[PDB]
């Protein structure tokens, strides 16, 4: 968690995104990264189980 | 028999989610058949989403699952809608047994190529609605390779 | 509900405690494991009703594999091993007699000289 | 139940969430062995109405024109592609399953299958090709595409290790090796291989 | 490989077992063996000059496997496993199998040897509900009791 790296991600959050799988209620989910590394949701699937 | 199906849409100028009403779906099962029901923007809802569009925003969708028990929803760009005269295409993927999986909302053509539009362009919903099933994997033939082999 | 399955292996020109040491005998593919004797029987157990294929590993030697067909009564019957025209039955003995074919060939020879 | 079993294969995006492919195969049992690779995915299972293992192969081709060959943004793919499946039977059973990598990609690709026994088999990709047509053709002459064949063997002189059997193999690694011809495996069980 | 030629000159393999749970070391001992048993399902027999594997047994890898109790008397080996329900007598000195045989349904306890007239027949094994007593030459059950 550097200064430049800080900087590079603050130029860059919204490029990235993460997907979780949760196998025990089968809902897949996912977020994109924000401005300052937070983040929220963006889209969301369900498998009946 | 046919199900109504809530379907709403968010755009906001920070990117929260205020999801409202905006239109329902009818799904006859019996026949596999989907139809959407909805109505034309106002005119500050036209405003933030020329504003939205501006600020290269989104535009999401949600349905629920049961016809508050859950959601699926989508997104798409919102510049990537407003340049496209409203044309825009909804996939709807369920279930083997029937229940829904998923929405899919695209837009044709993609992009962003920065065009002007203006007010009168943006009063009718070009919308197409789809409903998708899984398909089926093929099997590995033999009996043609057998006769063949013969 | 619980049946076994019977064998003997043979390896020709080969007594058998010079190979048993490092073998097992599979139904269907790890999902039952057994071990040879000193003289090279063996028996598996605990084997549902069904159809299962039975192999001898050994990393030295070659076995064919057996399908054998068991009944919900015990009766049991043994034939060949064929994925293409699954119908087709040929009859092979039983209890098992897996006699072995020679060591596997895990390498590829050359060209010997040509005109005498 | 052995009549109402099945398995089913999604093909979705990361990014946007879209459903690319659905399929559900029916008549199918695990464990089930998967490999997802630059254009293929290749996954076995157990069919039980016939009782063996099969492979299934799945190929993705776009048109014949480029969308966009400056990027490729998946905000802005609005096509679907084309899918091909085709379908093998595999006489064994499988411990473990991979693929060979390479600096450049320019090599030909192989699956390294482990099998129950100890075994290591290399299987070329090109005998799994969901295009290899039925019913020969000019066409299929000159592509030059084998005729489809619904067996694949297994051949002792394709073992990559002669008689240093792997025991209970669980895992299989490959590496570049900074050359363009060769590659470094690694198959751990309660075992150690390499070569 | 191939040709036959390149053994050895690039590959290597290494054998293992798992962590030990039971062991027997007293032997003739001009036979230098040394049997164990790990958790891993897996029975071997140790060289004790250099530490390298005579032979190896492997078993299935899930719970169906787990070995329950091991003897030893003179060059044989006794093992209970799968959950009180199998019992076999390895041989030491070649590594392959005296008999196997399958106990009736229950929960093991314990195993133990006994013997009259200063010479052990017989084999004793304990479960929740019965005891059974078997034959050690061939495992031919002698008799059960409730
Ligand atoms: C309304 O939406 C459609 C949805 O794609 C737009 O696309 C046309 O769709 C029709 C129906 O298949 C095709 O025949 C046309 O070729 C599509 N247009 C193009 C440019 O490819 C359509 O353009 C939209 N506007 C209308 C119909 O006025
Ligand atoms: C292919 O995609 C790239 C990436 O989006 C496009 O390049 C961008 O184009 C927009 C306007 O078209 C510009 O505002 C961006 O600055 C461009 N970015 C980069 C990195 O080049 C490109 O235009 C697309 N090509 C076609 C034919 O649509
Ligand atoms: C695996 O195969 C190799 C084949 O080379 C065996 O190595 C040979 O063993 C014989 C018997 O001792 C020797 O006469 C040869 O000289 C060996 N070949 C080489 C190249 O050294 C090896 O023994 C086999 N593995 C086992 C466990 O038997």
Redesign the pocket.
Request: proline share 0%.
């Given at each position: 968690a550097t200064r430049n790296v800080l900087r590079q991600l603050h130029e860059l959050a919204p490029s990235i995104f993460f997907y979780l799988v949760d196998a025990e209620q089968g809902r897949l989910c996912g977020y994109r990264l924000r401005k300052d590394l937070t983040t929220e949701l963006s889209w969301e699937l369900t498998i009946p189980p | 028999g046919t199900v109504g199906l809530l379907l709403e849409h968010s755009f906001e100028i920070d990117d929260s989610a205020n999801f409202r009403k905006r239109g329902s779906l009818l799904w006859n099962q019996q026949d596999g058949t989907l139809s959407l029901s909805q109505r034309q923007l106002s005119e500050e809802e036209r405003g933030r989403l020329r504003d939205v569009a501006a600020l290269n925003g989104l535009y999401r969708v949600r349905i629920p699952r049961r016809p508050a028990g859950g959601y699926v929803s989508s997104f798409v760009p919102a510049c990537s809608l407003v340049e496209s005269h409203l044309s825009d295409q909804l996939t709807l993927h369920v279930d083997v047994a029937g229940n829904v999986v998923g929405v899919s909302v695209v837009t044709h053509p993609g992009?962003?190529?920065?065009h002007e539009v203006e007010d009168v362009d943006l009063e009718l919903f070009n919308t197409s609605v789809q409903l998708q099933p899984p398909t089926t994997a093929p099997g590995p033939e033999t009996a043609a390779f057998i006769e063949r082999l013969e | 509900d619980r049946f076994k399955i019977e064998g003997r292996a043979v390896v020709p020109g080969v007594k058998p405690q010079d190979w048993i040491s490092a073998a097992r005998v599979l139904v269907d593919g790890e999902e039952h494991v057994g071990f040879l004797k000193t003289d090279g029987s063996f028996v598996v157990h605990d084997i549902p009703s069904g159809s299962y294929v039975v192999e001898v590993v050994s990393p030295a030697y070659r076995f064919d594999p057996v399908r054998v067909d068991i009944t919900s009564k015990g009766k049991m019957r043994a034939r060949y091993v064929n994925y293409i025209k699954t119908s087709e039955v040929v009859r092979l003995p039983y209890p098992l007699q897996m006699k072995s074919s020679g060591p596997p060939s895990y390498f590829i020879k050359r060209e010997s000289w040509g005109w005498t | 139940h052995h009549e109402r079993t099945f398995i089913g294969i999604f093909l979705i995006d990361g990014v946007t969430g879209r459903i690319i492919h659905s399929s559900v195969q029916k008549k199918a049992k695990g464990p089930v062995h998967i490999v997802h690779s630059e254009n293929w995915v290749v996954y076995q299972y157990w069919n039980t109405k016939a009782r063996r293992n099969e492979f299934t192969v799945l190929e993705l081709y776009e048109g014949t024109e480029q969308?966009?060959?400056?990027?490729?943004?998946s905000l802005?793919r609005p096509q679907l592609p084309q899918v091909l499946q085709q379908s093998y039977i595999f006489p064994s059973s499988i411990s473990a399953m991979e693929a060979t990598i390479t600096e450049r990609g320019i090599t030909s690709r192989h699956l390294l299958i482990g099998l129950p026994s100890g075994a290591i088999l290399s299987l070329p990709k090109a005998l799994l090709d969901p295009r290899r047509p039925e019913i020969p053709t000019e066409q299929s002459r000159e592509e030059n595409l084998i005729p489809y064949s619904p067996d694949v063997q297994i051949h002792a002189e394709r073992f990559i290790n002669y008689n240093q059997t792997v025991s209970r193999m669980r895992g299989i690694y490959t590496a570049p090796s900074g050359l363009e011809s060769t590659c470094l495996v690694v198959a751990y069980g309660l075992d150690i291989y390499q070569t | 490989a191939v040709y036959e030629d390149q053994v050895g000159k690039f590959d290597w393999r290494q054998q293992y077992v798992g962590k030990v749970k039971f062991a027997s070391l007293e032997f003739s001992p001009g036979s230098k063996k040394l049997v164990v048993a790990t958790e891993k399902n897996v029975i071997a027999a140790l060289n004790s000059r250099t530490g390298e594997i005579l032979w190896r047994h492997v078993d299935k890898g899930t719970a169906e496997g787990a070995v329950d109790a091991m003897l030893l008397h003179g060059q044989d080996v006794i093992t209970v496993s799968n959950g009180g329900r199998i019992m076999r007598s390895w041989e030491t000195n070649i590594g392959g199998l005296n008999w196997e045989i399958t106990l009736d349904s229950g929960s093991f306890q314990a195993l133990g040897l006994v013997g009259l007239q200063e010479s052990v027949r017989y084999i004793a094994v304990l479960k929740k509900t019965t005891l059974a007593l078997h034959h050690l030459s061939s495992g031919h059950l002698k008799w059960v009791e409730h």
């Open positions: - | 992009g962003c190529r920065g | - | 969308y966009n060959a400056t990027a490729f943004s802005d | -």
